[PDB]
Amino acid sequence: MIIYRDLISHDEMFSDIYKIREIADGLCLEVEGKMVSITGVDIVMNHHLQETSFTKEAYKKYIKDYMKSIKGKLEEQRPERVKPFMTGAAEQIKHILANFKNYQFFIGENMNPDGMVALLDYREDGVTPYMIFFKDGLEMEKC
Amino acid sequence: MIIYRDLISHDEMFSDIYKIREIADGLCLEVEGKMVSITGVDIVMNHHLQETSFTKEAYKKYIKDYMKSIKGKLEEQRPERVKPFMTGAAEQIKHILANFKNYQFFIGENMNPDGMVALLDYREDGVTPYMIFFKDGLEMEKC
């Protein structure tokens, strides 16, 4: 099994028991969930993700801060990934802010305030959930 | 996370993301799943378990051979489990054969004809699925 952890907080975020597809040119992972019967998202239940909430202005403050943290990690492990990530994430942040109320927000079970914030959306059938993660803020652990 | 593997075919069978319970005096692990959306059992989908079928006669012959593979590995591992493994296992077979119709049967994704066969039943509420595994045929690795 492959487990994906938060690069900052080291929480487990999900694993390859779900369907995973890269999007936005390697910037993000889209993870397919399943609804299960408290009627919820298996990804969230399975990994004890905690739902959180932002005002738009606190997210803007948070996500710039988080982007700077990922820039730091990349600078010391993959310096070539820095300017694609900073470019791509800026493109992505401004779109996320547009649809801000279409997303729910989740953090790992450590509730580290410097951790990644995943976005939960639902497909148009209103039943299948999916979650968006910043791929550069994740670290794969085989076991 | 803890992954539970099939001692014989090395397939992944489940992980500790489910409620897991020891039953039958430490002979078996009972793993509680959730119904999930096609309608099925999260455990089965998450680890790509494969449903199989038996005649009672075929199951009888499969299961006694399975016990000899597990007796063998126990002889070299912990010979003090052989007495209570073959004891409970024999008692467990009679219970399964006596209620043969209430079960579905699942093997790891490699469909190894000699790997463990997990049983799928449902609770008195007829909605909650749970799967039965032979504990002595599992190895509990971490990450």
Side-chain angles (χ1 to χ4, degrees):
Chain A
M1 187 188 286
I2 297 285
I3 298 167
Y4 296 79
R5 304 184 92 85
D6 196 314
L7 190 61
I8 303 286
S9 61
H10 314 94
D11 305 351
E12 295 180 3
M13 296 293 162
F14 58 96
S15 67
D16 57 341
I17 65 163
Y18 319 103
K19 193 54 139 73
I20 296 161
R21 268 181 286 218
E22 305 182 83
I23 60 147
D25 208 48
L27 190 64
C28 296
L29 299 181
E30 197 147 295
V31 184
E32 289 222 277
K34 280 163 286 121
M35 281 321 270
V36 320
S37 317
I38 197 88
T39 293
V41 186
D42 58 336
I43 302 160
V44 170
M45 282 172 283
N46 289 345
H47 307 281
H48 302 108
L49 303 188
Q50 307 290 313
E51 192 194 5
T52 191
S53 71
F54 289 97
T55 71
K56 277 185 99 153
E57 168 226 290
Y59 186 70
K60 277 196 274 223
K61 171 170 65 58
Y62 154 85
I63 200 77
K64 281 153 70 148
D65 208 307
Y66 173 80
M67 257 175 67
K68 305 267 175 168
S69 266
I70 296 311
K71 187 195 177 176
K73 297 279 186 176
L74 294 171
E75 281 172 342
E76 75 188 355
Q77 204 75 291
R78 256 202 309 158
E80 82 281 11
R81 185 53 204 195
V82 178
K83 73 180 154 200
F85 165 77
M86 297 298 280
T87 314
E91 292 165 58
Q92 209 64 271
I93 266 82
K94 283 189 231 272
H95 157 244
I96 291 169
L97 289 171
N99 307 113
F100 195 68
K101 278 301 106 191
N102 286 24
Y103 296 119
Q104 286 176 286
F105 311 97
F106 295 89
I107 65 185
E109 77 165 18
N110 286 336
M111 305 188 84
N112 191 325
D114 311 314
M116 190 191 298
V117 159
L119 269 37
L120 172 68
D121 206 60
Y122 289 100
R123 303 190 66 177
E124 213 251 341
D125 70 2
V127 321
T128 303
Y130 58 91
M131 281 166 110
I132 310 305
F133 303 84
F134 279 108
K135 171 159 153 256
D136 300 298
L138 300 169
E139 67 153 342
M140 255 191 30
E141 68 169 347
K142 160 69 169 190
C143 51
Chain B
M1 193 187 289
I2 306 154
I3 279 70
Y4 292 75
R5 214 165 203 95
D6 181 334
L7 267 192
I8 288 190
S9 63
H10 213 245
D11 294 283
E12 298 176 12
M13 304 290 286
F14 60 98
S15 78
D16 69 343
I17 66 179
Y18 320 97
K19 205 163 154 304
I20 297 150
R21 183 180 75 138
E22 274 209 274
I23 72 179
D25 271 345
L27 178 79
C28 289
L29 291 181
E30 187 185 87
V31 183
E32 184 171 58
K34 295 160 276 154
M35 288 314 291
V36 68
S37 303
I38 193 60
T39 292
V41 172
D42 62 349
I43 302 161
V44 162
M45 307 179 65
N46 292 347
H47 317 287
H48 312 110
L49 298 186
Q50 305 290 313
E51 188 179 9
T52 180
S53 63
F54 295 82
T55 64
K56 268 219 202 196
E57 204 179 9
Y59 184 73
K60 294 215 274 249
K61 179 151 94 185
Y62 157 79
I63 192 73
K64 63 171 80 92
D65 208 58
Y66 176 83
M67 287 161 76
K68 299 292 192 179
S69 300
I70 301 294
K71 181 198 201 159
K73 274 96 171 169
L74 279 171
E75 296 274 350
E76 67 190 2
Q77 226 64 44
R78 32 207 304 170
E80 72 280 21
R81 283 291 313 175
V82 174
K83 189 107 173 283
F85 168 73
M86 302 290 301
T87 281
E91 172 167 10
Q92 169 80 337
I93 287 171
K94 312 290 123 201
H95 172 63
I96 296 160
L97 287 169
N99 296 265
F100 197 68
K101 188 175 297 192
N102 308 130
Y103 295 117
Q104 303 174 247
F105 308 114
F106 291 84
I107 62 200
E109 82 178 323
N110 295 135
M111 307 207 70
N112 181 338
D114 293 323
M116 185 188 318
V117 170
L119 311 179
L120 170 57
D121 218 340
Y122 289 76
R123 310 279 193 200
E124 198 143 341
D125 61 21
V127 56
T128 305
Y130 64 95
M131 298 190 70
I132 309 307
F133 299 85
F134 278 109
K135 174 181 176 182
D136 292 298
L138 298 176
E139 51 185 347
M140 321 175 184
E141 74 196 24
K142 295 88 183 178
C143 303

